Amino acid sequence: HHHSGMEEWNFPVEYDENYLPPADSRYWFPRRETMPAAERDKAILGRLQQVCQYAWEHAPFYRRKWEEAGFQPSQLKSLEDFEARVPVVKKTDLRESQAAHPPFGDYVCVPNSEIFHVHGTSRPTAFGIGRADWRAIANAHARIMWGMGIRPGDLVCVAAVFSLYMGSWGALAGAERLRAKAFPFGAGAPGMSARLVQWLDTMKPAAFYGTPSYAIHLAEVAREEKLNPRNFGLKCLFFSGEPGASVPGVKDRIEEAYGAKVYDCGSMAEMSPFMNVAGTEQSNDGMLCWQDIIYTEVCDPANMRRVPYGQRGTPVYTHLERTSQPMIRLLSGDLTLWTNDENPCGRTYPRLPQGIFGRIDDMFTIRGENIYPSEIDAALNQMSGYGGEHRIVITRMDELLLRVEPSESVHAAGAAALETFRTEASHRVQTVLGVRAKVELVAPNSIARTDFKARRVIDD
Amino acid sequence: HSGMEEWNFPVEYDENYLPPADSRYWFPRRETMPAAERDKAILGRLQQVCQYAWEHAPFYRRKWEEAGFQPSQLKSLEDFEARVPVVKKTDLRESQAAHPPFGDYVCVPNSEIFHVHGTSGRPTAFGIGRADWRAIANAHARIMWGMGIRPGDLVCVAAVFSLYMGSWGALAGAERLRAKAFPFGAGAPGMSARLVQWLDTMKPAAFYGTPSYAIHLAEVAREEKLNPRNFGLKCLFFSGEPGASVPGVKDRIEEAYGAKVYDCGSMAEMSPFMNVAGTEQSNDGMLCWQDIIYTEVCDPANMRRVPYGQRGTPVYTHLERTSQPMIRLLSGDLTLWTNDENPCGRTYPRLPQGIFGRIDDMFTIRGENIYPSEIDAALNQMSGYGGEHRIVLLLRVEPSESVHAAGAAALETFRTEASHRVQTVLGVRA
């Protein structure tokens, strides 16, 4: 047994399948979840050394990538060495590896005979998950679902498509390991939602899994079917796959529609167990980073080194308990804010208070400061007077200009209504960015509208 | 003492067992032992099952008391067919309304319920216990092994993953078999076009679904400018609908994919539903895997076994289930059973033409039982058939739009040619 007191802490992991926490325990693993972060970081470092050494020996993808970047496992002697020496893995590197070594790439590690399930992404990426990794996922997900207040015997509805995507399978595996009554109804086919609302009104689930948008659609289908969604008897709904569970307006509407608590969870399919970022019953706002399952680093995309707590960056993830297709510093490309304050549940994990929002796409620097176009887009979309289009113009790091469309009604209301909107837009942009921007208005329907992804940045 | 492997009630299969790589039978004793010796062990099992039901299911105690039966009276397979009354789907629906949500035939306590599944009037709820999930997974891996599917093979399960037991049963089997389970599923728009790229890339050894979906998938592959033969399939196994034992359908799918087609499937109430399934060598029709689920092909007028070579309705009994066990569940389906030598060497009764109808709206004219479903199947082979017909013997058949337009001679040709194929099927002047 490990000197850290950490429960079933070993690599490769082999969890006791019959263990269930005492019924009065808040934590599935009290020590792993509440030990001082400094001691957990020491244990994490030792695990990263084991995992990197493991990939060096079983994955030519990593040995090659690391050798090109001048890294070798003997060099990993601190978490500072991990961020500075180990290069990040991109999705394009995974697709390249799978194209050169089909079907699963040369980072699979396990022999082909160990592959239990085949899943994938929406050129697609193939997931070849080993038996041992499937057990490691089910155990981590049961542990995190316990944290949400979900218990043995509870009826758990998994209402997400059961296909290629890791989402629904991960929730179902967690529900099975927890000894919950699993109700794998799924989603995606016409006529399903109207059938589900009758099943939920009869069966009375204690918990529901899906996407926030599907839960909003199911609430509407219920009212069309002359059913009250508050009568399904749900204690909670837990969501992954898209934003919404940490967006105040969206979360509040779902909590009101169902009369239950909403929990945010979910990193990436590549990062299963994806509930490694998840809220708890008491830390119900945003998500906790369950660091001893998967090591999350919120980084500055300019150098891929950890940003200080209270700052914004990109989640970078490392598997600590996977032997098949392990991910070592996979860049998410998402945006988030992390803190390390006391958590209401008592868990000593970093928190993502606003969950995951935006992207690193088309990021630029205005004198040391990283500016994210998604953040400027989010700030303007808080305004009822915003017309739906804007452009980002940079001159001389140095000068930041924003060309913004007001809506048709603001433009019709006159000169004073346009100026009030332009001044408020300047105030809101400064708040979100934390840097001064010049704001100029442009006539409604002046800027090009694209059905594709908008590329709103001009020059540098 | 029978020699039957892991033969125990409640069953508890060794999860680590894999047969030697070159062994044809997953369980050689259970599969190739003399039928008379297996029947003896099945009788002993029906005794344990009926006693378990008596103690745990007021549904069975109530239903058996009405018909005047008690477990002490079960002394032969003849006592089982003559004394134990059959169960109908309507009886289950009443039991679930009286004792919600799973009925007073659930047997197991609530803590034992692993998965919640069901059927499409009033839906039946399935509460499958943990132990039964393992017994289903084990039975299906054994039967898939009999189809030539092996550890390591990529198995594409292309049926909806939801309420229905089909897809989950094929997945449970593929997982226990240590195959690479590929649960892509079905039912959502855009799925077929993305599946053909996955199958062209991954090259699956086995495919599971319905015969109609496999036909639809072949057409979608062609539209996508791919060849279904380029998937590298050894076999396709189907359940849920007829087709895998229908010559015209089976031949079409085998040709389109360049692989073998296997018929399987009884009822969702009867999971492990692969209790009726074909094998690699006995590839036509299905065998009845009697030591998993006891099948009786019965005369609907008295619910007793018809002799081998005759037609009747399947009646099913779980031998390895503790949750919602079915004892003489009436299928309402129509089949033919024989008990000749099987090419694979398994000593099981066989359904040579699989399941080919319903006992619904059957009428007896001159002592001969006529099945409207058989008339329909016969006419649905004739091209001149207008897609509709009537009985209420008087046969009022609709001719095709082309036949009607082709005149009197062509219409009399249809009218008489709609008597020869029917004649061979019925055996009575129509």
Ligand SMILES: CC(C)(COP(=O)(O)OP(=O)(O)OC[C@H]1O[C@@H](n2cnc3c(N)ncnc32)[C@H](O)[C@@H]1OP(=O)(O)O)[C@@H](O)C(=O)NCCC(=O)NCCS
């Ligand atoms: C865009 C969308 C909401 C438009 O809905 P629509 O097709 O015009 O019409 P409907 O509202 O009647 O929904 C039709 C079917 O779409 C599916 N659907 C609708 N909203 C859904 C949602 N948010 N999530 C998942 N499936 C959804 C259901 O199968 C639904 O049928 P049902 O009501 O009988 O169960 C929807 O079709 C969709 O694709 N949603 C997902 C968008 C997305 O984020 N896609 C990225 C991949 S997850």
Ligand SMILES: CC(C)(COP(=O)(O)OP(=O)(O)OC[C@H]1O[C@@H](n2cnc3c(N)ncnc32)[C@H](O)[C@@H]1OP(=O)(O)O)[C@@H](O)C(=O)NCCC(=O)NCCS
């Ligand atoms: C066959 C049926 C779907 C109608 O087909 P259709 O709509 O005229 O045919 P389309 O070519 O327009 O197909 C539309 C979608 O229906 C589904 N579908 C079509 N044929 C199907 C078949 N034979 N089996 C299953 N799904 C089928 C697919 O999702 C398809 O979309 P895709 O090709 O992008 O994957 C319908 O009559 C039927 O029988 N449905 C059965 C559904 C059911 O009970 N499923 C559960 C089985 S346990």
Ligand SMILES: CC(C)(O)C(=O)OP(=O)(O)OC[C@H]1O[C@@H](n2cnc3c(N)ncnc32)[C@H](O)[C@@H]1O
């Ligand atoms: C997480 C999972 C397995 O359910 C999933 O759907 O992952 P997938 O690989 O399909 O897509 C991952 C991306 O979806 C977005 N996403 C997933 N979950 C959330 C979430 N909870 N909040 C904000 N964004 C999310 C992020 O941009 C993330 O990088």
Ligand SMILES: CC(C)(O)C(=O)OP(=O)(O)OC[C@H]1O[C@@H](n2cnc3c(N)ncnc32)[C@H](O)[C@@H]1O
């Ligand atoms: C068998 C299963 C679990 O795949 C299924 O779908 O069962 P379900 O309860 O929905 O329907 C059972 C009925 O479908 C039909 N059926 C199923 N399999 C076959 C089959 N192989 N051949 C001819 N008919 C079949 C029979 O009429 C049977 O009574």
